[PDB]
Amino acid sequence: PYTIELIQPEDGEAVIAMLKTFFFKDEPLNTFLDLGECKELEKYSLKPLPDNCSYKAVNKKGEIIGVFLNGLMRRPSPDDVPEKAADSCEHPKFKKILSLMDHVEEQFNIFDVYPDEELILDGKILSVDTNYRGLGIAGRLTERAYEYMRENGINVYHVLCSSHYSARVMEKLGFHEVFRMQFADYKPQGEVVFKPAAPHVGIQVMAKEV
Ligand SMILES: CC(C)(COP(=O)(O)OP(=O)(O)OC[C@H]1O[C@@H](n2cnc3c(N)ncnc32)[C@H](O)[C@@H]1OP(=O)(O)O)[C@@H](O)C(=O)NCCC(=O)NCCS
Ligand SMILES: CC(=O)NCCc1c[nH]c2ccccc12
Ligand SMILES: CC(=O)NCCc1c[nH]c2ccccc12
């Protein structure tokens, strides 16, 4: 038995503690790199919280057993200066992940897919406690956001998935691929950066229109 609840400002430390236990260690790119201590990812994870659309799954003892951290993304202004996230990162392993994200954004802009949309919900960090996996918690976290979207006239939910495994979960939830890139094809300086196990394949950006 668990609840799905809005993540509050006072929850920051508990969210970080949960992510350090799971996501930091067991998201495929993090585990490939052996991310280790990463204060900059802690910072990254806390950033979307004040948008008031991030959710926690909580067990009967009051422990966080899952999170989906979401942020609002706004269409770039016509005079927008695209910034590289990797430029403000000291941690070398996390910088590799941020560089990958920058590269995806250079190749694919979600706002091109939806020219009429000013605001899109961005699913940034999804993590479920191992002992609670395969119970549909990812789906219940995701679906709690639909309510926020409906309450605020947001039509599109955008989620970058770091493995075909997690992209499949999003497909079950009614998302579809809008962009993909094989790890074998990601060679920003001429050589492969990420070589996780073959079934991961690469990144897939997933979208749902609600
Ligand atoms: C991706 C993740 C959030 C899914 O959460 P979840 O709540 O377990 O999602 P689901 O319940 O829908 O289970 C997904 C699939 O995992 C498999 N599964 C079943 N039991 C499982 C278990 N005990 N442990 C792990 N996976 C299991 C099943 O294939 C299941 O699909 P199905 O139930 O439709 O047959 C979770 O695996 C996770 O935290 N992964 C590591 C971090 C990560 O990669 N996050 C996503 C980045 S995009
Ligand atoms: C919805 C979701 O969790 N996407 C995953 C993106 C991701 C993979 N590795 C990371 C390391 C640090 C920050 C983000 C990531
Ligand atoms: C269109 C399609 O079949 N997607 C699923 C498999 C796949 C092909 N290339 C990828 C690159 C990254 C992730 C997944 C993939």
From Swiss-Prot:
Query: Could you say which residues are annotated as the site Acetyl-CoA?
Result: K172
Tissue specificity here reads: In the adult, expressed in the midgut portion of the thoracic segments and the frontal half of the abdomen (at protein level). Expressed in the epithelial cell layer facing the lumen of the gut (at protein level). In the brain, expressed in a sub-populations of neurons and astrocytes, and in a set of distinct stripes in the optic lobes (at protein level). Expressed mainly in serotonergic neurons but also in subsets of glutamatergic, GABAergic and cholinergic neurons (at protein level).
Activity regulation info: Inhibited by long-chain acyl-CoA thioesters, oleoyl-CoA (an analog of acetyl-CoA) and tyrosol (an analog of tyramine).
Query: In chain numbering, where does the site feature Has a role in the catalytic activity fall?
Result: E27, S162, S166
Q: Where does acetyl-CoA bind?
A: L126, S127, V128, G134, L135, G136, I137, A138
Q: What induces it?
A: Expression at the transcriptional or the translational level is not regulated in a circadian fashion.
GO molecular function annotations of the record: aralkylamine N-acetyltransferase activity; arylamine N-acetyltransferase activity; N-acetyltransferase activity
Write down the EC number. Answer: 2.3.1.87
Site (Might be involved in substrate binding) found at Y44
Q: What phenotype has been reported when the gene encoding this protein is knocked out?
A: Has a darker body color. Shows ectopic pigmentation in the wing hinge, the posterior pupal case, leg joints and cuticular sutures. RNAi-mediated knockdown in astrocytes, does not affect numbers of astrocytes present in the brain. Shows normal baseline patterns and amounts of daytime and nighttime sleep, but while awake are less active. Upon overnight mechanical sleep deprivation, results in increased recovery sleep next day. RNAi-mediated knockdown in neurons results in normal patterns of baseline sleep. Shows lower levels of activity while awake during daytime.
Kindly state which reaction or reactions the protein catalyses.
a 2-arylethylamine + acetyl-CoA = an N-acetyl-2-arylethylamine + CoA + H(+); serotonin + acetyl-CoA = N-acetylserotonin + CoA + H(+); dopamine + acetyl-CoA = N-acetyldopamine + CoA + H(+); tyramine + acetyl-CoA = N-acetyltyramine + CoA + H(+)
Q: Where in the cell is it found?
A: Cytoplasm; Nucleus
- Kindly state one GO CC term assigned in the UniProt record: cytoplasm
Name the keywords, alphabetized: Acyltransferase, Cytoplasm, Melatonin biosynthesis, Nucleus, Transferase
Give the main location: cytoplasm
Pathway terms, separated by semicolons: Aromatic compound metabolism; melatonin biosynthesis; melatonin from serotonin: step 1/2
GO biological process, any? chitin-based cuticle sclerotization
Similarity annotation: Belongs to the acetyltransferase family. AANAT subfamily.
Task: Tell me the protein's name.
Answer: Arylalkylamine N-acetyltransferase 1
**Organism, scientific name:** Drosophila melanogaster (Fruit fly)
Q: Which gene encodes it?
A: speck
